[model samples]
Target chain A: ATSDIYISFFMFTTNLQPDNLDYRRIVVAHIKKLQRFGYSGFEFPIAPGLPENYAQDLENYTNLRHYLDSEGLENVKISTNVGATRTFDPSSNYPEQRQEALEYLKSRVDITAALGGEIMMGPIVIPYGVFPTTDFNEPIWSDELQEHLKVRYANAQPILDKLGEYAEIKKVKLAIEPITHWETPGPNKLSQLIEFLKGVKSKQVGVVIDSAHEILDGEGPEIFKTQVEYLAQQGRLHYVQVSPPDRGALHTSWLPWKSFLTPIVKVYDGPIAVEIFNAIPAFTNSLRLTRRKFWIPDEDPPNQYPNAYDIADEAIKVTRKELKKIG
Target chain B: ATSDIYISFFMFTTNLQPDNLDYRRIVVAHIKKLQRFGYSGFEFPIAPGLPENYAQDLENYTNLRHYLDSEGLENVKISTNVGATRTFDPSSNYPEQRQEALEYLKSRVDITAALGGEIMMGPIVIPYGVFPTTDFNEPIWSDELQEHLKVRYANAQPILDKLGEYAEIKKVKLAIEPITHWETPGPNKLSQLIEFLKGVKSKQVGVVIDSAHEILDGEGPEIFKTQVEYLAQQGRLHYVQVSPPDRGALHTSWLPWKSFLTPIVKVYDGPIAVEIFNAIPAFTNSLRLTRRKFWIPDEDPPNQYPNAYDIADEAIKVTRKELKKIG
Candidate 1:
């Protein structure tokens, strides 16, 4: 009854990213290959950098955009992935660091605009994979931790509001992703993101719901439906990403697709990106993944289960399947 | 997002129907060609015949089932289409003709079971393409037409009740379709079908919504939604067919996909068949199609617009596209 929805793929399939590459032709190779697997667009990871490197970063993305158009991919849609490094934390207690964090996000927003992107999403309020620990290094996970983060959210709200104003100017939507409690210190649920946004007034600064995080920390479908409806009603549901809990092969994962998507499709109707964090060098070290790296189809063939290409192809098929059944 | 849906192709691409030729091996040839275009199943048109040919019809379908299995299409799904011929019209005022209609439907149900098919759909209550006319041969298309069909629906009710009881035993779902006013005399809308089904007491007998018919004669989305909801609640929204109004190429048709599907996906979830009346020998005279025949891929390729294979491929693509968006 409905038309096919737009689908996009995250660029985590390749470790060779826009952030590291210098006006690279190799990037188009990845885009072209992924496009054949039925992706309508791509989400690029824009790694965090300092003020000193900001100008060069903008030029690189601008050139990449022109290069993509030159390579006949001008019609291909794009979005960006950006996050707060510990040094770029908007929630930092130090006033100086908070100002730098605002500049950092503004630069990324500028880059996203340069790359012809619209949505820039990640853990922007709090640093991803950076958790708070007690003096002995034990995890500080409790309601007291929520109380401790209250002050951090307070420090971050104004900075994020300022960033949102800049993002509006750049025509970029800033989506604050809630990382899993296992991977981050605070704001790991939709309720927490809503709570964190209490003082922020920019509708452009919204939330990106990732399936991986939802699977790990979501209250359940009953509550999830209410949260999604509320976010959409408030215009705060900016993006949605489909990633299996294991964050490996998309086609072979234990995804509770119907329960997860029933609420989502009822309200949100933007692009749904397939975000597979492949076992790249950075992810392996940070995530300590036990699964083998997917063989890049453009490079080596699969050491299978299947190659990334097979996984990507089947991933869209599976997603479309579940969506067809329930969407 | 909705999952990719179960898609089936209606076998109108070729004039070689099951009712023709002696247990033809060429039938599987058509099936194999269509399966390549992404259809998981095929809907066969069962040409109506008298009681004398009934036993032979059942045997032929039984042979075709094993033949399909031998050809490695065992997992392939099957559905049948059987309409009321003028002589077999259950709505005929003659008690003899109504008795004949019941036997005809019962025989088709047995044939559907023999063919390993579950759903049998078409204009079973009334004869398709046979319109009511005045003595001067002009169409009777006024308010009096509604009053005229009232007795017909009443006459058909008991026959269908019996057919449904037999269908329940045969494990066949009898889906009565409502063709457009351009092609048929009455029951041209979901509301009309709902009203026609008032006295029918079998849950196994239901309705099939065809896009072409709906596009030509349907009420707007708002009323359609209510009717679909009511049908689904009654478990009578049995099958949905996607076809352009022109009944030609699916890829480039003007389809009101979103509006047509929103209400449907909310309640109905079933295999959606792509019904294209290709410009073959049987269709040109009946449908008065000006579009050229889609070249049967196995025979000759298009003479695109597109070949029947291309049409079929794009038909499913278009159907899935619409379904993905709303469903």
Candidate 2:
């Protein structure tokens, strides 16, 4: 019993849509390796799509669950990394657009439940890596950006409240992830996110605190401790994530794993997920990933990309060693 | 003694240029009243202009300093709230533009020293309340703004270093003010400001920890205490400013006076300036001051503006009462 919390790794695959069986086979094989490495769970990313086709999406998650059960890996847990993309934007001014965002989110909650996943989390208000655009490349003044956020938060509040109700009923937790300001404009700080959650007014609407973001956005261990203590006392710390500053492999010199986990272990006993956006074609330009891929068999030939299994194996060992420092 | 900290009020007068005698008269009368009400210092604003004509500006402040000395208020201190206007930007990318900014700042240092003002502080890198403009009225994504800042900081670093050298020779301190993100796009947080200061590598360059900005930017008492401790340890906390979240009267119920002062009393034995931008003609539009000029005589009829003496007296009393809690 090194720790009571479960350690999970992100499943990096090029394909996650409903029609991809090769992706499922690759992930199922990866899950077996994770179970052997003493990992209790895995989190896979969800792409944006129309709400009407979500039954097919649910079918895909159901098949993965069946595969897990049949492979004697029934104890392994699953969670969905539902990326909020251009298909829906909860903060848009239009009522129809917001409703579509709500429908899309409700479908994600349904899919997460169908997969027997406990939580569905990501930047739900606006899509990740999608920033408000202007004609010029110059710095947008804060006054203009602040005015933009005032209306954006007001429009997003109602949609989040309704989604919170839907998630509560579906028995699936929805975690509002606050990325760094470098990644998104508003809702970058935990305090700002807490203010939004207060307006949301739902037990099911909580936070997924990410270490890389917290550090980059002017939060250290003390702030991390304060946020965790406050959220744990309120019973709203839905999830926790640990990623390096570069958003690469976790077993590196960049992350201060001991300091990050010390305060977290005091109150949080949930899944501590290692979320790494590897240098895939999708994220190379946006995330500035230097490596080609984190072991894509066909695209990334031998010795080019780091072996996913070796990286996960070393990351878990290092994480477990650092976590013991808390005790 | 409850504290060694000097309590000062902003002398928000319309006329601050070198050619304004009426502005000098009004400020003189105001300073007399502040002395009676137990204020130890007064803060005045500076507008950017040529270094050659700064001798005239220096003469005006010297006269003010002499007046305070002649009126048996020699103990009264002075500090200039140097507003960074569009004529100069310390963080501008162009070399000649940055040179002009440095010369402008150095002249301000000479003027501040002439006035017997120890600290010349405001948004020194960027102009106070002036933001970068884009083509549209939308949020400029942080990634783009961050890239802009990376360039801006690099450009501003040499100018600030040179200005720091000038300030040291003139025996005047330069305090970099970090306003809220709503006010400026960059260096909104204390951590961000500290990072910039480290690059400049100047003992004469420091920080003005303003209460309003700290609260608006999601910093509470614990964060405040930590910042004060860090800056005090580094000996870089040059000045301090207290204002309500709305930037209104300090005697209001909005600001957490105790929490704001509790940390300062521990390590900072410096002036605690009460910075309020009332509805002066110059500031009404930019600062959004709803209340008409705080007792600007001859311009407004009686019963329109709050009596400046009354506001100052009550504010000092409340602030002293709160400071006692720190002990």
Candidate 3:
């Protein structure tokens, strides 16, 4: 049973105040819940743009880490930087603004470390909520933008290399979540992620393969398997995210869970994190429906998600069972 | 400037398919995209449960009216429904399944006539999507869902006095979008709506209001305003709708646009449809978003709207000028 288990993140999201059931208390309570359910680690959301600055957030994390340790919970991994950036894009053409963004991202690295989290994440070079342009032929790119990218990458290389060195020193694995679509790099596919990791060429660097994001870009079980196998074989699989077809939890909606899980169990280490939202009424109102309003019953059983946490627990149980079955 | 104006419909959703550019040919296209340019009317997303029996779907209502001939398209409205059998209180004894659901809802009514639309839309006295709770509670019959009250309205004594008629042949008004909560009454805001319409009550019987289905616990703007205005004024406002927020033509996300807009523009003569969807890429991957994933982001820039349309046209130009000030 112990060998069957895997690490799972996706504990809580603080963005929607109403949906939260007293998160400060939830953090402590959930550690026990995960422990009772035999979860190895909990991945919590760390927003870089919180106005309170990293110092306060870091203190909270340190306190949380201490609490988990006292409760005999082994913190496997930590997820941070859910929002891309609150301010500027250092990777963009605005030289001064871009510079500021880089500094901000750089500061996040320290925060994650302070929080006792080994995993630090953000766009290696990108912003949040930015989408892709449709006309592939007429790219929005320009010579000036190209030059700016080159300079930014050059400047970032030294900083990242230094950061990687720090990671190496701290014995932490620095994962770069290759967010696809209109975000940072449109690396929607596993192949795209592999390419970026190769380009980064840092021993400390690896990929944060997220399935929820991949679905938007059309990645399924077969594609997931091929990439994980390829990465594991190549010694490049640093960290794998047990994300849902929707970024919420594994239990919600009718996503192909087994498809995503089979490949993850086969490749990644034991334990997976469930990235889902907190279930509170206030949050529900704030949560806007983005995709097309499939308001009608096109098919039987009009589409909707199940309880997010229930999904997480089920995913953990099923994956553990699979691991045992594989033997 | 008039030529610059336009309208859109979900029926034309066929054109805006894998390649949504063809949506431009339909009338719904112009109205949807240029709403910010002052073009509005006839929303899409017709209500559900029109009976798979096609005859029943159309026969109940003689015709589905459009705004093409109505004094040059000033009024914009839409028609929709919730459901019938799903709203029954199973805890009371036994729930209303198909036969019972049909009995209360599907009827050839006079309200549809007064509204000039054949389709009478409303929640088929039930909930949609996942029935979040299988375990029934005491089923608090809130003021909105008082079952005993129905007896007086449908009693034999009153009807026999009135020429043996079972119920008054009130003119049929189409569409009744009521408020439904996860834990509360069948339609918690039903009373508010009923009370409001009492003042406006006429031969037309159906009270149609939509837009805040996502927010209103049945007490959204449409029901409350009617209580004080037309309903209390001894006049009736039967036909109504809850439209997707106008960001120019389409409702790209789950903003509370419907809740905010319905009361202010209640009782539009023409059918108020909910033409809620997004651009090409968003539509394609919408299924993967846990039902409705991409519904955040307050404003979609001009570029974000589908590029196929000519936004520079004269009618659209006027709309843009008005929207620019708001922006």
lDDT rank order: 1, 2, 3
Q: Name the lDDT of candidate 2.
A: 0.70
TM-score of 3: 0.45
Which candidate do you rate higher for DockQ, 2 or 3? 2
C-alpha lDDT values of all predictions: 0.74, 0.70, 0.42
Expressed as tens digits, the lDDT of each residue in B1-327 for candidate 2 is: 654334443435634554566556666677776667677787767766666776777787677677657767677777887755667888886778888888788778887887788899888886665555577753342344556677777888888989998898888888888876545666776867888888887888999988767754544455567878999898899898877654555664335566667777778888887776555555544443323345645555666447556666767786777777677
Candidate 3 local lDDT, residue A272: 47
Looking at model 3, residue A132 earns an lDDT score of 26
Give the per-residue lDDT of model 3 (tens digit) for B104-165. Answer: 34332332332243445554333332223224642222121344324322331221122112
User: In candidate 1, what are the lDDT values of residues B104-202, reduced to their tens digit?
Assistant: 888888988887888999999878877776799854442346667888899999899889988998889889998765467767777778987888999
Worst 10 residues of 1 chain A by lDDT: A3-12
Better of 2 and 3 by TM-score: 2
lDDT of 3 by residue, A1-327 (tens): 344233333334443121233554556565566566776555555545544464665566666666556755655445554434536454454656655665565556665665566666545544554432335642222222333345544444544555567666665566656553423333344655565455465677666665555543443345567877887676556655555432343432323345555665666663344454333331232322111121212112343544434555766775556455655
- Per-model tally of clashing residue pairs: 18, 0, 74
lDDT, model 3, position B175: 42
